[PDB]
Design a protein around this ligand. Structure first.
Ligand SMILES: NS(=O)(=O)c1cc([C@]2(O)NC(=O)c3ccccc32)ccc1Cl
Lengths: 372, 892
């Protein structure tokens, strides 16, 4: 029976080659970074919930060790991990690679994982809960992994949960959320990926009863008019979202107590280089690329403050939401040191009861109201 | 603050303009910054009532409602006529649900049913349905106009103006009518809408006249003609069916009624001129269906409650005591009809008078006007729908000889050419006037279109594509499938031969469109379903465990761009096609000088070239600083679950001698990594080198040339396996597999039973097994000199040095070969020189040579020397030489 199954799979994979890619037929092609899947099952579950029977879902594990010492273990443990996934009833492909560092292995996976058109277009990673107590090199590597995912047009999906990452353990996602609401903070236009992921989640039996609330930014003067132009774009997409809220007060200065929290949270990583030219900043950067010069802090005052203010708005709306979705701010390479970038991600999702997902598309349309 | 939010950041905020494609107002296009920007550094529109409801209702209503409905009710009973109407409404309403669901998805543009079907199911069936629908509507224009002409000719002969004759006179009247309709249609969409509204008002006045007349106490003549007003006895008597005549069968009534009440796509077919199709099509069509159904039910109920089935009509039939005799209770109202119901003669009543509806009404002229309005409205709607559907078809340019008619003259498209063609077809088909032999074909065509609409809905729903997000949510995939199946079955039952003809035409059109391979890509449930099948079966294959009996050769071919080394890809495809996985790898070192979209376009182009090449292979390209790193990445990650490559096919670098030695060093490193990763290596050496479709030696047949296999090492059967599957193909059938097994003459049957006769068990059937015991005998000095001279340029003369001194020297020059190694492995060196001597004499006319690949010891054997054997192992060999070394796992 294996031969016929393999032949069917190969035949259909080959036949998928002539099929062209269409916006109406786009599918989230997920490459979750779980390592050993049993260590971080929650994450897997979530992706499965919206990939089940709908799109491909690969699991990426990077090994640290010579091939010879790993080849036997590689072959005899990949099957164990696959059988664990199957026993958990997930239609995901396990794939492990060996590299000196996690970033290199993730790069090779994103570059080569996939057969033809069934290659991931999204990288689903888990939040680094200990990014402060960890060696700054690790935080720099994680941020660089995000940058690499962007370089490949991979839509990033950073998942943060209060509990953390770590019979099979039961996670919150295997239960039913019920009537709780799904808050989607579509602050910036990522091409719709921030909206498709929660739409597919609600289409599942466990999220059908969730009342999806969409939050957008507007100005206090034209709240009413802007409430309708966005309640109309959602209608054109025919996503079934219930409400549309607007927050003119996102640009107001964060509270004087919370803002200092952000500054004290980035105190250790400050390089204190706010009076020297960029050509005079690199030498004290070679060993410490994560250090944040005072110069870079000045140009990111508004942006850093806005993230703090965003966390204020979310902390007063989604206190009791089943799931929180917030667009992922995009730092610029060469101007957003890993320390500053991680602070935003930490500052964005924090202090609440987060099933928060920080999604961010590749600035390419994934939802269309315009049949060809 | 009080700023328009996204005012202090280069990132944008969601806006409709970002997703709009059409010429969105504003003379511009606010487009979100590209990921490389944030990242990196440095015409009247009608409403639903006047565009869907009115038009669909006018198309539904026809002559049958006025002329055959009272007959059907009288013949079948009120209950049975209601049941027939309910079955017809069930089919039509399920089709309407399907069409509404298909309409809601996306923004429906001009084209009508054709546009929706093509954009939902696929271009292949879309074109066929478009052509069928266009022709059917064109012919229906003629049929409706002929019916109207027949009614007018009847009313004329009622007044004594035969002109020519009952026949070939309706020709003239209906041609005049069709010219009138064509002129009005060409006038303008507003004029057509006004004409439809006028016909609607006329039909409404006719209905009101009928209903008022039925409530007037009967007159003398009307009473004689069987009209008796509302009576409980008459209503109860007509409940049961009184079948009579050759059409007295229930299925006959059902077949007569069904075509009349199916014109439910009149509104959708002009969706181009709809203010908002997504909300006007569903509700309008459902309301039209409901109102027509209620009208039919009410007409049946009332007419069955006023007119008796049989009546004489002669005034002398008054009832006087003694005279005559009664059966039933009609005489209770002072009328005797026995003189007929015994003889079955007179012509009046609900079962023998088709014009009973006109007589029961308050004024016959109003009924005639209603008939005229119904026929004309149906004809005009058919003409408009056919013209617009054909215009969309031609705009879609699927078919070769319809492009001309697509272009639209004037403003607001206005498809004048299509209108003229439809009018010409209608007049040519009406000149015949012989439509009864052609009507069932058109009815079956429309049934085919209904089946395809319902199946498009069901297929889209079952596929469950992310793009399938339809606003209408009162449908059912199972209901749509039931409607489609019922459409096909009804089409077959009404007339099996006509159904066969329609299915044959549709199949011809579908096969023609699929043959013509229309390049247009609209997105469809077909493509999404193909992806779903691929994913489902790939995951299924993944869930299966691993063992030996399922082993397949899964080749990763280092061919860079496939169009630069066609011979390698052709070779791999020959023995991998339809058997296992084949992946064409490609490593770009470069700076890559491009955003990812450019690389994606190049990859799509290369995949298209592969597909045109007729090769089932996946083109995977990566980026890395050097070729070694790209190969390592591809070996490490390329694949999907179980269906990963386990064999590395790579070409031969013929110009290693004159190139920088680091190139040969990294080549040998690639081979060593492949061996380390448990990859069976396969070196494809061609005498001319590896570097619209380029011809290759592996394409042409080769007849009966000898396939020589020079086995000299038990690698697990990989060496024999490839030629095995390589000869089971058509192009390698007549060739003889002369495997020169490395062994001894005494062993001709041992490795025979070991492989050759075990390959009688392995079903290889190798004819000859010629032993070569002279491999170890000393080679010729000249050939030996050729080998030493080849290794001379890389000579390092490290032998006159200490072991540690040996190690230090190569901390920067590991390509160079020391003399100490030469003495260390002299026996192997001369072994390969002689082995090439054995092959050149023995295998000179062979079609393909397979030789076990020599394997040096990394570190213990230098890279340059190892490559030197490979060059010397297969030098000057005429046919394409293949070097193989298996995983060390028994393949068979
Ligand atoms: N205009 S239409 O395509 O929606 C349509 C028209 C009819 C039609 O007007 N109704 C008919 O009885 C008929 C006969 C011949 C041609 C056309 C017709 C029947 C079904 C449909 Cl789906």
């Amino acid at each position: 029976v294996q031969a016929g199954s393999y032949n069917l799979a190969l035949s259909y994979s080959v036949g998928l080659n002539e099929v062209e890619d269409h916006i109406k037929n786009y599918r989230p092609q997920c490459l979750v970074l779980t390592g050993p899947p049993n260590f971080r099952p929650a994450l897997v579950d979530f992706v499965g919930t919206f990939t089940r029977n709908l799109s491909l879902m690969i699991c990426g594990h990077v090994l640290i060790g010579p091939h010879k010492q790993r080849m036997p273990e590689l072959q005899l443990i990949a099957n164990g991990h696959t059988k664990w996934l199957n026993k958990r009833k997930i239609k995901a492909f396990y794939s492990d690679v060996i590299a000196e560092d996690l970033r290199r292995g993730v790069q090779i996976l994103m570059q080569a994982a996939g057969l033809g058109r069934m290659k991931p277009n999204i990288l689903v990673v888990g939040f680094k809960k200990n990014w402060q107590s960890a060696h700054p090199a690790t935080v720099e590597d994680y941020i660089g992994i995000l940058h690499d995912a962007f370089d490949f047009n991979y839509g990033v999906c950073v998942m943060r949960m209060r509990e953390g990452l770590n019979e099979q353990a039961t996670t919150i996602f295997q239960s039913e959320q019920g009537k709780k609401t799904i808050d989607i903070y579509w602050l910036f236009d990522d091409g719709g990926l921030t909206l498709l992921i929660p739409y597919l989640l609600g289409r599942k039996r466990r999220w059908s009863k969730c009342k999806i609330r969409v939050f957008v930014g507007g100005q206090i003067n034209r709240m009413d008019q802007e409430r309708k132009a966005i309640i109309s774009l959602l209608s054109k997409f025919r996503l079934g979202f219930h409400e549309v809220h607007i927050l003119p007060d996102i640009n107001q200065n964060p509270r004087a107590e919370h803002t200092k929290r952000f500054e004290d949270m980035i105190a250790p990583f400050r390089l204190n280089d706010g009076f020297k030219d960029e050509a005079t900043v690199n030498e004290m950067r070679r060993d410490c690329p994560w250090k944040i010069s005072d110069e870079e802090i000045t140009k990111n005052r508004v942006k850093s403050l806005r993230q703090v203010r965003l966390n204020e708005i979310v902390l007063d709306y989604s206190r009791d939401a089943a799931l929180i979705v917030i667009t992922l701010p995009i730092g610029r390479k060469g101007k957003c040191p890993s320390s500053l970038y991680m602070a935003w991600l930490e500052t964005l999702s924090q202090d609440l009861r987060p099933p928060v997902i920080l999604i961010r598309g590749n600035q390419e349309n994934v939802l269309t109201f315009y049949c060809q």
